Amino acid sequence: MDDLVFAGNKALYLVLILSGWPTIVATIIGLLVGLFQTVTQLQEQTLPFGIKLLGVCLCLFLLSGWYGEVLLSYGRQVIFLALAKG
Amino acid sequence: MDDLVFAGNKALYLVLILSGWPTIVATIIGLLVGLFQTVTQLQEQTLPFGIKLLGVCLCLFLLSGWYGEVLLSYGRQVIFLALAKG
Amino acid sequence: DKDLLKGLDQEQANEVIAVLQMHNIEANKIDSGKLGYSITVAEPDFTAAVYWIKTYQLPPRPRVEIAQMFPADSLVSSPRAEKARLYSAIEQRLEQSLQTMEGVLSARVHISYDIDAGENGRPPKPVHLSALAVYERGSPLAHQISDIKRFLKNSFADVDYDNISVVLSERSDAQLQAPGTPV
Amino acid sequence: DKDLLKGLDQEQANEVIAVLQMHNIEANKIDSGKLGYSITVAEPDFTAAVYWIKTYQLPPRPRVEIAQMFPADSLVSSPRAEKARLYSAIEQRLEQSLQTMEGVLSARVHISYDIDAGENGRPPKPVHLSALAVYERGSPLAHQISDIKRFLKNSFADVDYDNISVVLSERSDAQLQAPGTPV
Amino acid sequence: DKDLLKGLDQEQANEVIAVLQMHNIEANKIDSGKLGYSITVAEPDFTAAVYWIKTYQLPPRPRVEIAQMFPADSLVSSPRAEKARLYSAIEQRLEQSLQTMEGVLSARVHISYDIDAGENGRPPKPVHLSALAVYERGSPLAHQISDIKRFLKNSFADVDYDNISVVLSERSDAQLQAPGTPV
Amino acid sequence: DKDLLKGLDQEQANEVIAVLQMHNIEANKIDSGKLGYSITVAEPDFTAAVYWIKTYQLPPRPRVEIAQMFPADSLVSSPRAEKARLYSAIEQRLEQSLQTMEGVLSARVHISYDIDAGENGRPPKPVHLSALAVYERGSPLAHQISDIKRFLKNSFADVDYDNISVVLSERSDAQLQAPGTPV
Ligand SMILES: CCCCCCCCCCCC[N+](C)(C)[O-]
Ligand SMILES: CCCCCCCCCCCC[N+](C)(C)[O-]
Ligand SMILES: CCCCCCCCCCCC[N+](C)(C)[O-]
Ligand SMILES: CCCCCCCCCCCC[N+](C)(C)[O-]
Ligand SMILES: CCCCCCCCCCCC[N+](C)(C)[O-]
């Protein structure tokens, strides 16, 4: 059922790319702040969380318009397929 | 009777088979990343999540087909066992 | 001397030798150990030997049994695989029993594998059996088919005389005299 | 001498030599060990050897069996793959049994693979069989088809004499005399 | 001497040689080992050689088999892929059986691949078969089509004589005499 | 001498030589190894050779086959890609089969790719076929269209003689005499 196959595969691909960007940013920031604590040999729990929050908020301010474009496109498309037979 | 026991056993057997591969790869990725973080001392904790999300989604793409063939064959079998008595 | 074959097994070599001797071709078997056996013949007989190796498709392939396809080294095996191993073991045990009957030299047995559609919800189907056997010379084959059928009928839970096929044959002439050496 | 072929195996070499000898072409087989066998002929016969090699499409491809398409070392086996290996092993075991009958030299057997549908939803369909075989000279082929049909019918759960095709042929004339050497 | 082709394999080389010799062109084969075979001709014959190489589109391509597109040595295989490899093995095994009939030199077989629809939720179409074969000179082709049709019909669960196409041809004249050397 | 082309493949160079020779232009092929082949002509023939290179758009582009668009080794495939690889293989196999018919020199086949729509929930359309072929001189083309139609009809589940187009042509005059060298 090429229609069910398409809609089902695209749902998962969209989950993977919508979620990837915030987690990539968070991971890279995490690594750099973890390193800096080693070369400084200076340690605390809170600095990485503090920076990660800002990094993710900026990520959302920037990309969020595109999240809307992608979701609207998919939303229309699935309805048209569901009611396509008539 | 034995049909009941057989069908109930098979249900657990199928759960085991289908769920087994994702949980294996999520284990192996967890061990490798945990070791790597001791081999080079880095105290990140989202990196496992970031990698294992991609790992699990990839094998869901790969096995998407066999999943549907197994469940169809099972459903037909149990509908026969339920209704075809004479 | 010309080389026909190399690296043969012992049971391949003795079969090749037997088939060449039957046609009056003197052959020689040589052992190289880890390299196996080699077969050699004289030049005047080389042409004939080649043509017979072609005609009989020698050396023989190893003997096939269904249990080889379901090695039982699995993690787990389906009902389909278990039922196959079972039937393949019963076939071998019956061939070995028949070889003990009076004057039988060899036999082959086949059973209908109901496994083809085991475990699709449908009930099983009645069994069928086929046998081949070789007898010593001067045996009343007609009177001996009855015994075999009788013996096979009660080895399985539901078998009809109509469903048992039996084919018998006599041994060929004995090869006792040695072949002549080329002049 | 001119090189026709190199790196052959033992079966390929013997099949080539057989077909060349039949047409009066004297050929030579040489062994290079790890490099395999080589075939050489004289110049006056080179042209003919080339033409016959082309016409018979030598050296032969290796023999094909369905089980080769479904290695058991796979991560997963479906029912379709299991039933494929089952039938691929029954066909081979029947061919090996027919070679034992009186006066047969070789045979081939084919079975209808119903596995190309899952045997699901739709009920299964009856089996069909085909056989080919080769006989010693002076065999009453017409009278021998019956035995084969009888033997095959009971080897499966549901087979009708109407659904069994059998084709027989006699062995060709023997090639016993050696070819003449070019002047 | 002028170089026509380099780095050919053994089968390509012997094909090219056969085609040129048929047209009275003397050619030579040279072996460079890991660099393959080379083909050379005299200048007076260069022009003709080039024209025939173009006309036949030599050297020949490797032979195509459907299973090459769906390799079995892959991590996962969709039902379509498995259902394809099965048919692509049955085709080859029928070709190899036809080659064993009396007087046949070579054959090709084709089957209708119903896999090009899944036919899920649908009734499966019937099978269609096509076959081509080459016979030895002096063969009664008309009387030999019947045997082939009979043999093929029972190879599959549902086939009608009307759905089987068979085309036969005879071997061309033999090329036995060597070509003349340029003066 | 003037350079026309450099870095050619073997099978491009041979085509270029063939086309220049046909119009009475003597050309030379030189091998530079890793740099490929080079082609040279005399100055008096330079103008003509450039005109023909333009007119025929030499050197030729390689053959295009649909499977090149849908590699077997991508991580994932939609059904459309698999189905396209399948037909892209059946085309090539039929071409290779037709080239074995009596007196055919080369051929081309095309199949209607229905794959460009699903035909889901819908009746899948019937297949259409086209073929081109080149024959040796003196062939009764009218009588030979029937054979090809008959053969292709049964290659697929549903084909009508009305849906098969066949176009045939004879070979051109043979180029046997060498071109003349400029005075
Ligand atoms: C995003 C997670 C949930 C996605 C659920 C998608 C369901 C697809 C159902 C069909 C799967 C089998 N298939 C692809 C052969 O149709
Ligand atoms: C920590 C907040 C998590 C919110 C998850 C959803 C993020 C995407 C949608 C909100 C986008 C808001 N924005 C950037 C338009 O202002
Ligand atoms: C504090 C987290 C709030 C998350 C939800 C915010 C509202 C949804 C985003 C609305 C704007 C969407 N956008 C950017 C495409 O216009
Ligand atoms: C967080 C994801 C949980 C997914 C659980 C369901 C797994 C099966 C998904 C349907 C089959 C695979 N596919 C790619 C078509 O989606
Ligand atoms: C959560 C179990 C795994 C996901 C698959 C669930 C079955 C979805 C329906 C399968 C339909 C198969 N199909 C497309 C061939 O019909």
CA atoms of E56 and E51, how far apart (whole Å): 9
Indicate the pairing of strand D129-135 with strand D2-8.
Answer: unpaired
CB pairs under 8 A between E and F: 114
User: Is any atom of ligand 5 closer than 6 Å to the C-beta of A17?
Assistant: no
User: Is any atom of ligand 1 closer than 6 Å to the C-beta of A8?
Assistant: yes
Angle between helices A46-82 and A2-40 (to 10 degrees): 170
**How far, in Å, from the CA of A64 to the mean position of ligand 3?**
7
Report CA A34 to chain centroid distance, whole Å: 22
Tell me whether chains E and F touch (3+ CB pairs under 8 A). yes
CA atoms of E47 and F177, how far apart (whole Å): 7
Tokens for B28?
Answer: 């192996």
Domain boundaries, chain C: 1-60, 61-170
Q: What is the identity of the amino acid at A60? A: L
CA atoms of D163 and D130, how far apart (whole Å): 8
Q: Provide the sign of the torsion angle of the four alpha carbons E67, E71, E73, E74, taken in this order.
A: negative
Spatial CA neighbour of B44 closest among A59, A53, A52: A52
Indicate the pairing of strand F27-31 with strand D104-111.
Answer: unpaired
CB B18 within 8 A of CB B68: no
Residue with tokens 């086209």: F130
Strand order, beta sheet including F164-170: F104-111, F129-135, F164-170
Q: Nearest ligand to the C-alpha of residue E118?
A: 5
Does F79 reach chain A within 8 Å, measured CB to CB?
A: yes
Does E183 reach chain B within 8 Å, measured CB to CB?
A: no
Tokens for A40?
Answer: 């400084």
Cis peptide before C62 (omega within 30 of 0): no
Phi, psi dihedral angles at D165 (to 5 degrees): -105, 135
Task: Return all residues near C56 (Cβ < 8 A) that are at least 6 apart.
Answer: C19, D105, D106
Cα radius of gyration rounded to whole Å, chain F: 22
Residue with tokens 């025929």: F56
User: Is any atom of ligand 2 closer than 6 Å to the C-beta of A60?
Assistant: yes
Q: What is the DSSP letter of E24?
A: T
- Give bridge partners of residue D8 from the DSSP assignment: D37
DSSP letter string, F71-108 = -TTSS---HHHHHHHHHHHHHHHHHHHHTTSTTEEEEE
Q: What is the DSSP letter of F36?
A: -
Quick one: closest CA in F to E112, which residue?
Answer: F156
CA atoms of E67 and C131, how far apart (whole Å): 38
Q: F109 exposed, middle or buried (CB, 10 Å; 0-12, 13-18, 19+)? A: buried
CB D16 within 8 A of CB D58: yes
CB C66 within 8 A of CB D86: yes
The count of residues in chain D is 183
CA atoms of F170 and E53, how far apart (whole Å): 17
Task: Return all residues near E40 (Cβ < 8 A) that are at least 6 apart.
Answer: E1, E2, E3, E4, E27, E28, E30
Tell me whether chains C and B touch (3+ CB pairs under 8 A). yes
Integer CA distances (angstroms), C180 to A67, C23, C26, C27, in order:
94, 11, 7, 11
Q: What is the identity of the amino acid at E179? A: P
Q: What is the identity of the amino acid at E146? A: S
Q: F-contacting residues of A 8-37, CB under 8 Å?
A: 9
Q: Provide the sign of the torsion angle of the four alpha carbons C141, C142, C147, C150, taken in this order.
A: positive
What is the C-alpha end-to-end distance of chain F, expressed in Å?
15
Q: Nearest ligand to the C-alpha of residue A19?
A: 2
CA atoms of F145 and F155, how far apart (whole Å): 16
Tokens for B26?
Answer: 């999520």
CB C42 within 8 A of CB C24: no
Indicate the pairing of strand E104-111 with strand F27-31.
Answer: unpaired
3-state secondary structure of C86: helix
CB contact under 8 A, B63 and E75: no
DSSP letter string, A14-56 = HHHHHHHHHHHHHHHHHHHHHHHHHHHT---SHHHHHHHHHHH
Q: D43 exposed, middle or buried (CB, 10 Å; 0-12, 13-18, 19+)? A: exposed
| Chain A CB contacts of F78 below 8 Å | 2, 5-6, 9
Tell me whether chains B and E touch (3+ CB pairs under 8 A). yes
3-state secondary structure of E162: helix
**How far, in Å, from the CA of B61 to the mean position of ligand 3?**
30
Spatial CA neighbour of F58 closest among E54, E45, E60, E46: E54
Q: Provide the sign of the torsion angle of the four alpha carbons B27, B33, B36, B40, taken in this order.
A: negative
User: Is any atom of ligand 4 closer than 6 Å to the C-beta of B54?
Assistant: no
CA atoms of D136 and D140, how far apart (whole Å): 10
Residue E16 belongs to what H/E stretch? Answer: helix E10-22
Residue with tokens 């020949």: E60
Q: What was the experiment behind these coordinates?
A: cryo-EM
What is the C-alpha end-to-end distance of chain A, expressed in Å?
17
The Cβ-side half-sphere exposure at F133, using a 13 Å CA radius, reads 28
Q: What is the identity of the amino acid at F119? A: E
Q: What is the DSSP letter of C175?
A: -
Q: What is the DSSP letter of F118?
A: -
Q: What is the identity of the amino acid at F45? A: D
**How far, in Å, from the CA of C59 to the mean position of ligand 1?**
54
Integer CA distances (angstroms), D166 to D108, D134, D144, D161, E139, in order:
10, 11, 10, 11, 21
Cis peptide before D59 (omega within 30 of 0): yes
Integer CA distances (angstroms), D99 to B46, D96, D146, F80, in order:
67, 5, 16, 47
CA atoms of B17 and C70, how far apart (whole Å): 19
DSSP collapsed to 3 states, B16-62:
HHHHHHHHHHHHHHHHHHHHHHHHCCCCCCCHHHHHHHHHHHHHHHH
Cβ neighbour number for residue E80 with a 10 Å cutoff? 19
Does A68 reach chain B within 8 Å, measured CB to CB?
A: no
Residue nearest to atom 5 of ligand 4 (CA): B60
CB E64 within 8 A of CB E56: no
Spatial CA neighbour of B29 closest among B59, B49, B58: B49
Q: What is the DSSP letter of F57?
A: T
CB E117 within 8 A of CB E123: no
- Give bridge partners of residue C111 from the DSSP assignment: C129
Integer CA distances (angstroms), E171 to D55, E139, E146, E178, in order:
9, 10, 20, 20
The structure was resolved to a resolution in Å of 3.3
Tokens for E86?
Answer: 């099965």
Residue F131 belongs to what H/E stretch? Answer: strand F129-135
- Give bridge partners of residue D133 from the DSSP assignment: D107, D168
What long-range pairs does F153-156 form, CB within 8 A, spacing at least 24? Answer: F153/E165, F154/E110, F154/E112, F154/E128, F154/E129, F154/E130, F154/E163, F154/E164, F154/E165, F155/E110, F155/E112, F155/E128, F155/E130, F155/F94, F156/E112, F156/E128, F156/F127, F156/F129
C169-C171-C173-C179 Cα dihedral, nearest 10 degrees = 120
CA atoms of D149 and D166, how far apart (whole Å): 8
Tokens for D150?
Answer: 């009888």
Cβ neighbour number for residue C151 with a 10 Å cutoff? 14
Task: Return all residues near B66 (Cβ < 8 A) that are at least 6 apart.
Answer: D76, D78, E76
| Chain E CB contacts of F96 below 8 Å | 61, 63-64
List of E strands, D42-163:
104-111, 129-135
| Chain D CB contacts of C63 below 8 Å | 96
CB contact under 8 A, B84 and C120: no
Tokens for C118?
Answer: 């085991």
Phi, psi dihedral angles at C133 (to 5 degrees): -150, 155
Residue nearest to atom 7 of ligand 3 (CA): A64
Indicate the pairing of strand E164-170 with strand E129-135.
Answer: parallel
3-state secondary structure of E51: helix
CA atoms of C24 and C116, how far apart (whole Å): 47
Cα radius of gyration rounded to whole Å, chain C: 22
CB contact under 8 A, F121 and A5: no
Task: Return all residues near E63 (Cβ < 8 A) that are at least 6 apart.
Answer: F96
